[PDB]
Amino acid sequence: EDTICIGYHANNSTDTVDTVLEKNVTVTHSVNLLEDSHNGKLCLLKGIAPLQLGNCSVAGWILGNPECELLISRESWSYIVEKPNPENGTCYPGHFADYEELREQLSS
Amino acid sequence: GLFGAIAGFIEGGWTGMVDGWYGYHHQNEQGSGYAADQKSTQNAINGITNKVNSVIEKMNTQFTAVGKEFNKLERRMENLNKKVDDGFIDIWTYNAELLVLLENERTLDFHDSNVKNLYEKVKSQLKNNAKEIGNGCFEFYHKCNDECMESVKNGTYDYPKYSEESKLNREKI
Amino acid sequence: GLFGAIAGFIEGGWTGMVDGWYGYHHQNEQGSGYAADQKSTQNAINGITNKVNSVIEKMNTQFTAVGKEFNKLERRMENLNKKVDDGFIDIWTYNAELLVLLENERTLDFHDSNVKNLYEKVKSQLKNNAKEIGNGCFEFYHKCNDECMESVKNGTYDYPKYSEESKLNREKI
Amino acid sequence: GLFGAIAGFIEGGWTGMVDGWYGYHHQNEQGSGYAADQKSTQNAINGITNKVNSVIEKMNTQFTAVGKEFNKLERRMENLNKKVDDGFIDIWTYNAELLVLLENERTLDFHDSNVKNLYEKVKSQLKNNAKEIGNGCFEFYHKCNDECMESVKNGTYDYPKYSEESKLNREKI
Amino acid sequence: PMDECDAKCQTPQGAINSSLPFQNVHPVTIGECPKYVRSAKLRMVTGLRNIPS
Numbered sequence: 223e224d225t226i227c228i229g230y231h232a233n234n235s236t237d238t239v240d241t242v243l244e245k246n247v248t249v250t251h252s253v254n255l256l257e258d259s260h261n262g263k264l265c266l267l268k269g270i271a272p273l274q275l276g277n278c279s280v281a282g283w284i285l286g287n288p289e290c291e292l293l294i295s296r297e298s299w300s301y302i303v304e305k306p307n308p309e310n311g312t313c314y315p316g317h318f319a320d321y322e323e324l325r326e327q328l329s330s
Numbered sequence: 331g332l333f334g335a336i337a338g339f340i341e342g343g344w345t346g347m348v349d350g351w352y353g354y355h356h357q358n359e360q361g362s363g364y365a366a367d368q369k370s371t372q373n374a375i376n377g378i379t380n381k382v383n384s385v386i387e388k389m390n391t392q393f394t395a396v397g398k399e400f401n402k403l404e405r406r407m408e409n410l411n412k413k414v415d416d417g418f419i420d421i422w423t424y425n426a427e428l429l430v431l432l433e434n435e436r437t438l439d440f441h442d443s444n445v446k447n448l449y450e451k452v453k454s455q456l457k458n459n460a461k462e463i464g465n466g467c468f469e470f471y472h473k474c475n476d477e478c479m480e481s482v483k484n485g486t487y488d489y490p491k492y493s494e495e496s497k498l499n500r501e502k503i
Numbered sequence: 504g505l506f507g508a509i510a511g512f513i514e515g516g517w518t519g520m521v522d523g524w525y526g527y528h529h530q531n532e533q534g535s536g537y538a539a540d541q542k543s544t545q546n547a548i549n550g551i552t553n554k555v556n557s558v559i560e561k562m563n564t565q566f567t568a569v570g571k572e573f574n575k576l577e578r579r580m581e582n583l584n585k586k587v588d589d590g591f592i593d594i595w596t597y598n599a600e601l602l603v604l605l606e607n608e609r610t611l612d613f614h615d616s617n618v619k620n621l622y623e624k625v626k627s628q629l630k631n632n633a634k635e636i637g638n639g640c641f642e643f644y645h646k647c648n649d650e651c652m653e654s655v656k657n658g659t660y661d662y663p664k665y666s667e668e669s670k671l672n673r674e675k676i
Numbered sequence: 677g678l679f680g681a682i683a684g685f686i687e688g689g690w691t692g693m694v695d696g697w698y699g700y701h702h703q704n705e706q707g708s709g710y711a712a713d714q715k716s717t718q719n720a721i722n723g724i725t726n727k728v729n730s731v732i733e734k735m736n737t738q739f740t741a742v743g744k745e746f747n748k749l750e751r752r753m754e755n756l757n758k759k760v761d762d763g764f765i766d767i768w769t770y771n772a773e774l775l776v777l778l779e780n781e782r783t784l785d786f787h788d789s790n791v792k793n794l795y796e797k798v799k800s801q802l803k804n805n806a807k808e809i810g811n812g813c814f815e816f817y818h819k820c821n822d823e824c825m826e827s828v829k830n831g832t833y834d835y836p837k838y839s840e841e842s843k844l845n846r847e848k849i
Numbered sequence: 850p851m852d853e854c855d856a857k858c859q860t861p862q863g864a865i866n867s868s869l870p871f872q873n874v875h876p877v878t879i880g881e882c883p884k885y886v887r888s889a890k891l892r893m894v895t896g897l898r899n900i901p902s
């Protein structure tokens with residue numbers, strides 16, 4: 223004879239969370255809050271380009287090291303790009319006090 | 331089945347239907363079929379919309395610059411700024427992780443709640459006219475067509491429609 | 504109506520009564536009227552008292568001085584102290600905002616729970632002696648005076664009082 | 677008794693049994709006795725295990741060195757580092773205190789939920805065959821031995837076993 | 850490497866989608882950014898449990 227039943231959804235899915243009372247807990251649908259990924263690029267903000275040094279230090283950039291392109295046309299930019307170990311420090315060495323402070327002032 | 335259904339009196343889910351997260355399964359002489367409850371389903375999903383908007387939006391992400399650097403005569407400030415940043419990092423980490431755990435629990439309870447509510451709504455029409463069976467389902471001492479199905483979906487039955495047929499077909503049991 | 508009542512089997516609230524957040528509405532030959540359930544209402548409101556004391560008090564507000572200032576050779580410390588303070592500000596902001604959302608939800612569920620509990624208490628006395636009707640209400644197969652009302656309020660009925668009158672007035676139905 | 681039982685329809689707890697947090701009390705001609713529900717009890721306690729692991733582990737405790745010190749020409753950094761540390765201290769304090777309150781509430785609700793679920797499981801077998809009584813208990817219109825007890829524990833009854841004995845012993849009432 | 854592509858937040862390991870609130874990826878950032886954690890993953894449920902039989 224006739225019957226009525228409740229119903230709800232399942233699917234083929236096997237995506238999982240952690241939860242208070244059980245782990246790897248499977249659900250139908252999920253959403254990742256996280257961005258665990260990076261494109262592996264140096265893109266630019268907004269249409270505003272960044273500054274690039276290539277091999278140079280900030281000393282070689284600001285002072286006018288001839289092997290560093292001065293690039294006066296670079297009037298403003300999005301962010302500064304270095305490497306960790308900048309090749310071209312000062313050709314005639316010398317202490318450069320408050321490197322920290324100058325960098326922080328030239329954050330932006 | 332916090333509140334008694336899902337791994338409760340119900341054991342498992344169904345892959346037959348995909349149009350909505352909730353519904354009914356109708357069974358009568360014309361055939362069987364699954365059919366989704368877009369009313370309560372859409373209301374709940376609107377709740378999830380307001381949730382996730384009310385999680386994402388509650389940040390304010392500044393036009394930020396993180397990093398700093400120091401010489402080796404600034405080690406006060408180095409171990410500070412490390413302690414500072416690691417403190418903040420850990421606090422966002424801890425609070426957000428707990429928030430994912432708790433919010434997903436409350437989401438499970440929200441769903442469980444909604445189906446339990448609907449289960450009582452199904453019960454409330456058909457109390458003596460049709461019986462609890464097994465789990466998940468009710469059997470009718472009378473018969474029901476697709477009009478009777480869609481009527482019972484939207485919260486309508488006409489209680490005296492088959493009150494007498496249940497009054498007779500009960501009485502062999 | 505998380506748990507099935509408020510926008511559940513009940514549709515809406517009532518402005519007739521103001522003395523307490525919960526109650527009953529009595530209907531008999533002497534008349535109609537609303538009357539509040541100060542027992543469970545007062546217990547719940549004591550719960551809200553302990554809540555709000557347990558939200559406000561959990562701060563410790565120091566005899567504080569916020570502000571600082573710097574020259575332009577301290578920009579490490581300026582952008583630091585900005586980052587520091589904005590970090591703290593945002594964390595209190597985020598945690599407190601989530602706390603208002605969650606606590607108000609749990610308050611709604613607390614209320615919904617209490618009325619559902621009381622609904623089963625009303626049911627537990629009058630199970631076969633009087634019937635579920637419609638929503639929100641029970642009909643008696645017998646009669647009930649104001650003494651019967653106030654008795655049924657405080658958790659007392661005398662089950663065999665009108666067991667037979669319901670046993671007869673049922674049987675036409 | 678958030679959900680209706682504990683200080684709800686049930687008034688209080690029992691010291692007779694210690695083997696598990698939940699169970700039944702059986703009463704028949706052979707005697708009385710208490711007996712624990714290790715299935716749901718063990719599942720719940722596994723939940724508490726995953727909880728407390730998911731509270732403790734979520735910290736990361738560095739190989740840390742807290743303290744600092746300063747002269748009196750560093751008072752910027754002194755009142756800073758005081759403000760810094762007191763800020764962090766208060767935030768961990770506030771969040772953790774709220775977390776103890778909330779988690780213990782959700783634990784109470786978890787327990788209350790589980791017993792309510794089990795109460796409906798006890799109901800689901802013995803619906804018309806045996807009646808609600810008082811609070812906390814069901815009376816049988818038929819008889820039940822220790823095999824019937826242990827069967828009813830693990831989710832088994834054989835509904836037509838004593839369907840007729842209840843069908844007759846009801847009918848004097 | 851450096852590229853003409855566009856973004857709203859940036860870090861040395863790469864340019865970043867500013868859609869979502871959080872990364873676990875690297876703390877240093879510039880722009881309109883996520884926030885860092887030390888974690889493996891964070892995934893809210895939309896749907897619910899999946900059991901066929």
Ligand SMILES: *[C@@H]1O[C@H](CO)[C@@H](O[C@@H]2O[C@H](CO)[C@@H](O)[C@H](O)[C@H]2NC(C)=O)[C@H](O)[C@H]1NC(C)=O
Nearest residue numbers: 275276277278279288289290291305308309310
């Ligand atoms: C940055 O430094 C690298 C060093 O690795 C330079 O590489 C040299 O490139 C030239 C051709 O341009 C070659 O003749 C050399 O043999 C390379 N040397 C090495 C060690 O790879 C690179 O030219 C520098 N770039 C700038 C812009 O200064």
Ligand SMILES: *[C@@H]1O[C@H](CO)[C@@H](O)[C@H](O)[C@H]1NC(C)=O
Nearest residue numbers: 232233234235236237250348
């Ligand atoms: C599950 O189903 C979805 C939608 O049909 C599909 O995208 C996915 O590849 C399927 N996965 C498996 C393992 O079948």
Ligand SMILES: *[C@@H]1O[C@H](CO)[C@@H](O)[C@H](O)[C@H]1NC(C)=O
Nearest residue numbers: 236237238244245246247248
């Ligand atoms: C989830 O964890 C439980 C822990 O015992 C284990 O039984 C199960 O196999 C795990 N599943 C997956 C997919 O990791």
Ligand SMILES: *[C@@H]1O[C@H](CO)[C@@H](O)[C@H](O)[C@H]1NC(C)=O
Nearest residue numbers: 477478479480481482484486
């Ligand atoms: C409910 O369904 C019945 C048929 O099943 C239909 O006639 C009626 O118009 C529907 N009512 C609403 C409010 O949708």
Ligand SMILES: *[C@@H]1O[C@H](CO)[C@@H](O)[C@H](O)[C@H]1NC(C)=O
Nearest residue numbers: 650651652653654655657659
């Ligand atoms: C309960 O109400 C009845 C009358 O309705 C009254 O006689 C009795 O004293 C009341 N009991 C308590 C404990 O208030």
Ligand SMILES: *[C@@H]1O[C@H](CO)[C@@H](O)[C@H](O)[C@H]1NC(C)=O
Nearest residue numbers: 823824825826827828830832
């Ligand atoms: C349940 O209990 C009955 C007796 O009470 C026993 O015969 C049966 O094997 C048990 N089943 C399980 C799955 O434990």
Ligand SMILES: *[C@@H]1O[C@H](CO)[C@@H](O)[C@H](O)[C@H]1NC(C)=O
Nearest residue numbers: 257261855865866867868869
């Ligand atoms: C950024 O993320 C959003 C949401 O995940 C997505 O819609 C968009 O396509 C993504 N864009 C890029 C460039 O990754």
